[PDB]
Amino acid sequence: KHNMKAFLDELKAENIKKFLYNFTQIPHLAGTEQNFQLAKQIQSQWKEFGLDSVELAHYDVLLSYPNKTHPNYISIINEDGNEIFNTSLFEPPPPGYENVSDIVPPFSAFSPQGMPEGDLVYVNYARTEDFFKLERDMKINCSGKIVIARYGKVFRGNKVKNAQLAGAKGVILYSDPADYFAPGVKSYPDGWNLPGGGVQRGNILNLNGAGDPLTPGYPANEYAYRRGIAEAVGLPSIPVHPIGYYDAQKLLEKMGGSAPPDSSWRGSLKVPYNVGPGFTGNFSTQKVKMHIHSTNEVTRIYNVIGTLRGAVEPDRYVILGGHRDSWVFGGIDPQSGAAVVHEIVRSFGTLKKEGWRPRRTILFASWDAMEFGLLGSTEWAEENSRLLQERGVAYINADSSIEGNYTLRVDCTPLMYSLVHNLTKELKSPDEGFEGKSLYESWTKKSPSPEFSGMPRISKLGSGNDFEVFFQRLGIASGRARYTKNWETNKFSGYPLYHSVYETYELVEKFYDPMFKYHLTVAQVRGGMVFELANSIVLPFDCRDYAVVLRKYADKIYSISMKHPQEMKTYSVSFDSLFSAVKNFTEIASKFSERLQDFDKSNPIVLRMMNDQLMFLERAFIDPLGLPDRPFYRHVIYAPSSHNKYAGESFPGIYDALFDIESKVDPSKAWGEVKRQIYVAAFTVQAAAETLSEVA
Amino acid sequence: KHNMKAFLDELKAENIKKFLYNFTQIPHLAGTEQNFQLAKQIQSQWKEFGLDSVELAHYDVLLSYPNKTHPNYISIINEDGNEIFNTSLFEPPPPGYENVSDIVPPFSAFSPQGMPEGDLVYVNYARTEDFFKLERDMKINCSGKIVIARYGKVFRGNKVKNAQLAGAKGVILYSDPADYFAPGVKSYPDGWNLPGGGVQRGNILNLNGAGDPLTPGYPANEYAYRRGIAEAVGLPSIPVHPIGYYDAQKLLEKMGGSAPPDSSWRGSLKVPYNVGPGFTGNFSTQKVKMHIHSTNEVTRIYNVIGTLRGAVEPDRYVILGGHRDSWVFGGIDPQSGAAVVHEIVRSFGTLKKEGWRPRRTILFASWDAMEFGLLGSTEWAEENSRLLQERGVAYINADSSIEGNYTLRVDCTPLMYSLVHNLTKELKSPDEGFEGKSLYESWTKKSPSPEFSGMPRISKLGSGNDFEVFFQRLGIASGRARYTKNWETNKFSGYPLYHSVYETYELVEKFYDPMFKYHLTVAQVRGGMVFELANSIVLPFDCRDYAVVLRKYADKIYSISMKHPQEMKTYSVSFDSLFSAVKNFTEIASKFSERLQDFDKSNPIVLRMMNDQLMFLERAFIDPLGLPDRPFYRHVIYAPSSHNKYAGESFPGIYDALFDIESKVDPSKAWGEVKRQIYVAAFTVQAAAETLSEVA
């Protein structure tokens, strides 16, 4: 029998291991020859595995690279202009890779060039609230200062935007052991911790969903019009560079001025964590100098797109996509995900060779230039937007399969909650102590829902990954899943060796998943989701789950507003329309569910009518005018946080209208805009509800 | 048998006559009680006629009305400030209506209030080229002048926008006998010509597709956020008022300054047509004073929406819509169209009562507040945009059925050309001399295609009517048809009594269509189109017809650019990408057509897949970012002309980038934008082509 069990059983941990090894022996930096060669390899293998067609889709997009003969570095400079300390020019390479060529040294992708000299101000995590505390409470002025910020808590691009608006003339990012060194664990290569010479690479753009900075709205094809750099989207205006904690200690140890305002500002280094500005009296004349010489350059990138044609509904697309480009070896990010995709394709191809085809078309994608701003996924979606918005059923992302070995993590649209619950009840837990128990059981035990007993936690989608164009721009139901750490065991996000040279095959094989059982579990979750979405006769979405969360989000946004009761009285700010729309959505979704379960099962038109209602329900939350000043974030329920691209925000339009409103100089204008966003949200919720009404 | 012949045969000229009489006895001004009562009557009758549901959809939108106790008028004022001449306060009412109440006096809807006094400048038709001739050639400065412009050639809102940008402080619009008095025809009531006391009403907004000025993007429902007046869309900044030619003669006769530049500037009045500024020497101290006291007010409007559920594809909508509100009696505009719709509903309802249902759902609409800026259609489409863009097959408009008695006029998407040709071959010509011949034959003879022998002329859709939101904002295949005059017999557009009190039932019954045979023919064309669109198994669109016109439009826009060969060399301006996309569209459309004719006819999924490809093809020409500064004009192939809302422009983005480019101060910026619009157009054409490729 060709059923999901046949698909799932075919997946092998040993295959995922072999693919991971294969994908992580050399660097695959976007825009480089090595990453083009891997694209061609993937294309060849997906054909071999049995997909109907496999093509490369290429684009020419703005990328950013250090100058090989003019290295980036930071100095402490004395009053004579002598550089008395210099940060590293490279991370010490790990055992057995000390002769690997083409390792890109640590840099902040898209930094402008410059050599700013000045006094240091320490800004904690450079969050919105961190700058609020400096400027408003501590009365420290960052204008013309170089800021030093620790990585963590929020996307680094938001840190740089915040530093820029504070008037900084440069940003130094560093990894504090507080956030990247788990107590009791040894540094790579003897454990999974970040060594003091390790550095986190990463782009510092603020694209807000635009894709290639030079071609917002349109694919960066051969005849594309490209904005001039000065009009490009999302580029930082001040130089930025990342360093490790050995180097950070040297920059921070001399810092004077004001003491840290409290303990939440102190990391784990043996330094005061003084905010500055500048150094203590003996060193008061020493300054910090950055030297950044990186260049932005239009460069060709290559997505691999594989198609497995649907037998019944070939014009309905279920997409499994993740990126292939890495900063260096990509041992976790992204190759732990790409190896999983590779095995999923191989398994589907095995069934196909035995004569099976899924009901709907499955598209498989190996995206390029993700590390430089989700560029490959976004340019492809811009090219294919009309096909995706009329035919796109769902998008399942496939970046890193692991960031820990504790339990499952799922972030997805409410439309997929029931699908996820049901699938995980059918899968075996790989966890020790849960032998013979379901993944649902271990996941629920280790990651309980904060709201419901006997349910697991499922989070909203944020952003910072390749689902962004599909979900927040185009309104295609999206999901992601991976294995994660125990947040009770160290509160820091992600894994210590993130975006460092130390993220290698050996890191995974030795420390994260020796038996590749967590990889296999994640292949089963991602592949199982794709299988159901593509094969079920009724799409496996439950509209009633959206009704429940809409009420939760309406309560939450109302509660934020109600911290300002006088203003709500003065400006007649009512949430009645939003609650009414949510009530209506709940009622209509309930009746739709009845019809779906009750309709004449022999009638393919009623079924498809009803499958189209399910498919277009996520689409209904799209506002074609976008959110304020963010035209590519069009989903009215979910946007990436304006303060942290990684985090999702609910009712983002109303959230941003309320944020820091007490500080607005024209309260009438400000509360007027709150009311406008309530109207837009209520209307959108009612309009989405009405797509589930009887059609005529 | 229930086939199109049964539907067509049921339509009766005598019924259309009875409905026209019924709809034209009292004024039905938008926002008035009389127009609400007619809405309720229509709703009742459509229910009686047999539709499944008939509801009122209401909105509260900005309308504009004169002040009943503070009349609008224009004066000539002497140096003492004595008003020595005053324009009429009302049009002399026609025979037997001299006691009808609630006739709105002539005014320009949405004029601001004011009493500007100044010297007159005569600006011909106030077209872009007319102001070019004044400012550039004649060196006449309109700043601080009151401009007087004759109606005709272009939409009056464009005249007012042009006057505003020329620095005018007021606009007087008048009907010149050259444009509104056919030689050899007597004035109403003894013929169909405009009498000297007749005046054309009409709104002077520049909405660019926005709908209600206060709620762009969102329906003007009960909880709507409304912009303040100062931020409203499309409102004129200077006072405006319309007059008849008896009054115009008094304002023009004294005009001095420069002579008219040539004969194209002279109308038919016994006056010099001097451009001014101001009056001849003896009257040089006399000035013109406007008195405008109209008020803008948010007012409730009511659309009637009738549904006839489809038997097979209830979630596919074919819409027949036209407006119901009139300026006064609406004898032609709109009731000659509304009576036709009423009879079409009655005929469909007759078939339904005998057990028939169309394959797809038919929606019937009686729109309100069309005369005030397409407000009812636009607000309803804003409310229902998600349903319309995923389910909307086609929109057939139904304003005035007649503007003459000579031949058929059709404006529509290329997708409907074949449908129209085939249907008109099946219909009888009502024309004298063409007894027993088809409508196709008489139409082709009287209105030959400028391009193809043996074919009739079919024009592009422009705007100024209720299809605008459906076609140019949402990308739903749209069409319209009416009987029209012979352009060889008088070149003036429209009919002389347009938007005057004299547009009555008697005008139609006596002078235009005594036997209601032209009305019946138009009911057959509009109803027949709806019947096919709603009932055929394969949608009756031919994608190959779009390929032919795309090549025509590409040639045309290229030819415009090629008037600047040096600049095309300097800035490397190539149209190669657009021609490539058009070639590709042609090739892919040809292969799609083969599959449509060749596919397995027993397979409803392949059929619907292919019906969805046909339905979404118009949709593919939509750009979600809209055209420059016109966010609600989203169709890349067709937009209303930036110089004349009534006219359609092809490749509008490139057209406007090229328009008057030789006058731009930064040719590099200007030609860069031409190249950007070529990229956008080429991409959109290729993307639309790719929706017709095999789906997987």
Ligand SMILES: *[C@@H]1O[C@H](CO)[C@@H](O[C@@H]2O[C@H](CO)[C@@H](O[C@@H]3O[C@H](CO[C@H]4O[C@H](CO)[C@@H](O)[C@H](O)[C@@H]4O)[C@@H](O)[C@H](O[C@H]4O[C@H](CO)[C@@H](O)[C@H](O)[C@@H]4O)[C@@H]3O)[C@H](O)[C@H]2NC(C)=O)[C@H](O)[C@H]1NC(C)=O
């Ligand atoms: C959640 O779902 C419910 C439906 O169960 C929607 O309820 C509608 O709510 C609006 C109010 O926002 C009601 O609007 C009112 O309509 C009255 C006329 O309604 C009749 O006629 C219409 C057609 O014109 C029919 O569709 C309808 O069935 C009724 O027969 C108006 O007279 C009301 O205006 C008067 O009162 C208001 C308030 O005091 C004044 O501001 C006005 O000046 C005026 O005096 C009003 O417009 C609507 O009728 C309800 N429809 C129903 C029950 O079917 C909710 O709107 C929906 N929530 C959201 C957010 O959409």
Ligand SMILES: *[C@@H]1O[C@H](CO)[C@@H](O[C@@H]2O[C@H](CO)[C@@H](O[C@@H]3O[C@H](CO[C@H]4O[C@H](CO)[C@@H](O)[C@H](O)[C@@H]4O)[C@@H](O)[C@H](O[C@H]4O[C@H](CO)[C@@H](O)[C@H](O)[C@@H]4O)[C@@H]3O)[C@H](O)[C@H]2NC(C)=O)[C@H](O)[C@H]1NC(C)=O
């Ligand atoms: C009308 O329809 C035709 C298809 O019949 C489209 O043709 C494509 O045209 C583009 C040019 O605009 C071609 O682009 C070229 O692709 C080359 C690689 O193509 C191969 O590999 C890709 C996957 O990466 C496959 O899809 C493809 O089948 C080929 O096997 C590049 O190497 C070319 O770049 C080089 O030359 C250019 C020009 O000198 C330089 O600027 C570059 O720096 C580089 O040196 C180029 O990108 C594309 O291959 C064609 N596809 C075909 C024939 O299938 C038209 O684009 C389409 N019209 C529009 C407007 O869309």
Ligand SMILES: *[C@@H]1O[C@H](CO)[C@@H](O[C@@H]2O[C@H](CO)[C@@H](O[C@@H]3O[C@H](CO)[C@@H](O)[C@H](O[C@H]4O[C@H](CO)[C@@H](O)[C@H](O)[C@@H]4O)[C@@H]3O)[C@H](O)[C@H]2NC(C)=O)[C@H](O)[C@H]1NC(C)=O
């Ligand atoms: C996750 O799994 C849960 C549990 O299986 C699943 O919910 C269940 O779905 C089934 C299938 O729709 C529901 O069964 C229906 O129940 C109603 C009322 O009892 C019946 O009227 C339905 O009968 C009709 O349809 C049948 C085919 O399913 C026909 O055989 C029959 O003739 C009728 O036409 C039907 O049996 C069941 O009630 C729920 N259980 C719950 C909610 O507890 C859920 O759908 C899964 N989630 C997915 C797939 O996303």
Ligand SMILES: *[C@@H]1O[C@H](CO)[C@@H](O[C@@H]2O[C@H](CO)[C@@H](O[C@@H]3O[C@H](CO)[C@@H](O)[C@H](O[C@H]4O[C@H](CO)[C@@H](O)[C@H](O)[C@@H]4O)[C@@H]3O)[C@H](O)[C@H]2NC(C)=O)[C@H](O)[C@H]1NC(C)=O
């Ligand atoms: C306007 O009217 C014209 C003239 O009628 C019409 O064009 C015609 O359409 C028919 C129907 O598609 C075409 O007939 C087809 O021709 C090809 C080649 O000869 C055949 O392969 C097709 O046969 C298949 O389909 C048949 C059902 O239609 C099956 O019976 C058969 O088994 C095959 O599956 C088919 O006969 C005809 O060629 C054109 N004539 C032209 C273009 O001159 C046009 O479509 C109408 N426009 C509309 C409806 O918008």
Ligand SMILES: *[C@@H]1O[C@H](CO)[C@@H](O[C@@H]2O[C@H](CO)[C@@H](O[C@@H]3O[C@H](CO)[C@@H](O)[C@H](O)[C@@H]3O)[C@H](O)[C@H]2NC(C)=O)[C@H](O)[C@H]1NC(C)=O
């Ligand atoms: C990762 O795995 C891939 C796939 O197994 C490896 O690529 C494959 O490498 C072999 C040996 O280089 C290639 O076979 C050889 O082909 C050449 C020319 O066609 C010829 O000399 C011989 O016929 C020989 O068999 C094979 O083509 C190639 N497969 C691809 C790319 O599809 C790759 O080596 C592995 N990478 C690492 C780091 O282990």
Ligand SMILES: *[C@@H]1O[C@H](CO)[C@@H](O[C@@H]2O[C@H](CO)[C@@H](O[C@@H]3O[C@H](CO)[C@@H](O)[C@H](O)[C@@H]3O)[C@H](O)[C@H]2NC(C)=O)[C@H](O)[C@H]1NC(C)=O
């Ligand atoms: C245009 O045609 C409509 C429809 O025929 C006319 O409206 C109809 O008018 C009659 C007479 O006023 C109404 O019948 C009457 O109803 C009232 C109360 O229900 C009652 O006194 C009697 O039972 C009587 O039969 C009828 O309801 C009404 N139909 C509608 C509106 O649906 C209208 O008079 C015509 N207008 C003109 C200008 O001719």
Ligand SMILES: *[C@@H]1O[C@H](CO)[C@@H](O[C@@H]2O[C@H](CO)[C@@H](O)[C@H](O)[C@H]2NC(C)=O)[C@H](O)[C@H]1NC(C)=O
């Ligand atoms: C990268 O840095 C190198 C080294 O400074 C630059 O190469 C120099 O370019 C200048 C002109 O700008 C020449 O006069 C020197 O001879 C070059 N030096 C060497 C060592 O080659 C190069 O411009 C930079 N590359 C970029 C900006 O991509």
Ligand SMILES: *[C@@H]1O[C@H](CO)[C@@H](O[C@@H]2O[C@H](CO)[C@@H](O)[C@H](O)[C@H]2NC(C)=O)[C@H](O)[C@H]1NC(C)=O
């Ligand atoms: C930090 O690096 C800089 C640049 O390489 C070093 O300064 C250079 O030293 C050489 C040799 O003494 C001089 O000829 C250059 O003029 C210097 N360049 C600059 C920009 O200062 C510096 O010695 C290094 N500091 C440490 C502590 O190693």
Ligand SMILES: *[C@@H]1O[C@H](CO)[C@@H](O[C@@H]2O[C@H](CO)[C@@H](O)[C@H](O)[C@H]2NC(C)=O)[C@H](O)[C@H]1NC(C)=O
């Ligand atoms: C329409 O014009 C009338 C007549 O001038 C206005 O009514 C007057 O309003 C003023 C206050 O603005 C009163 O003092 C007068 O007593 C009113 N006169 C009469 C004759 O009623 C009215 O304001 C205007 N209506 C509008 C603006 O809608």
Ligand SMILES: *[C@@H]1O[C@H](CO)[C@@H](O[C@@H]2O[C@H](CO)[C@@H](O)[C@H](O)[C@H]2NC(C)=O)[C@H](O)[C@H]1NC(C)=O
């Ligand atoms: C044009 O209309 C104006 C306004 O009605 C007339 O001027 C008014 O005349 C009365 C009576 O003589 C005066 O009391 C008012 O003060 C005047 N108002 C203004 C604004 O001037 C004028 O007489 C009319 N002109 C003609 C030729 O009939």
Ligand SMILES: O=C(O)CC[C@H](NS(=O)(=O)N[C@@H](CC(=O)O)C(=O)O)C(=O)O
């Ligand atoms: O440009 C963007 O939006 C983000 C690109 C890139 N995304 S990412 O966070 O590294 N990708 C992954 C990292 C991981 O797979 O662990 C995630 O979503 O967790 C980054 O943050 O540098």
Ligand SMILES: O=C(O)CC[C@H](NS(=O)(=O)N[C@@H](CC(=O)O)C(=O)O)C(=O)O
């Ligand atoms: O606001 C608008 O866009 C136009 C509203 C209104 N349209 S209209 O030209 O009068 N409608 C008709 C007039 C007619 O049916 O003769 C048309 O399309 O020809 C007008 O021009 O005043």
Ligand SMILES: *[C@@H]1O[C@H](CO)[C@@H](O)[C@H](O)[C@H]1NC(C)=O
């Ligand atoms: C910070 O300093 C700069 C001048 O060096 C000044 O423009 C800015 O207003 C200052 N910020 C404060 C104190 O608000």
Ligand SMILES: *[C@@H]1O[C@H](CO)[C@@H](O)[C@H](O)[C@H]1NC(C)=O
């Ligand atoms: C793997 O699991 C064990 C058991 O909790 C844990 O001690 C170890 O830290 C985990 N490894 C990683 C890399 O999280």
Ligand SMILES: *[C@@H]1O[C@H](CO)[C@@H](O)[C@H](O)[C@H]1NC(C)=O
């Ligand atoms: C027209 O006159 C006004 C001043 O009355 C002036 O601002 C404007 O520039 C003039 N236009 C010309 C002559 O270009």
Ligand SMILES: *[C@@H]1O[C@H](CO)[C@@H](O)[C@H](O)[C@H]1NC(C)=O
């Ligand atoms: C009706 O047709 C006749 C014949 O051409 C023509 O003389 C007359 O002017 C027409 N009436 C109108 C209102 O166009």
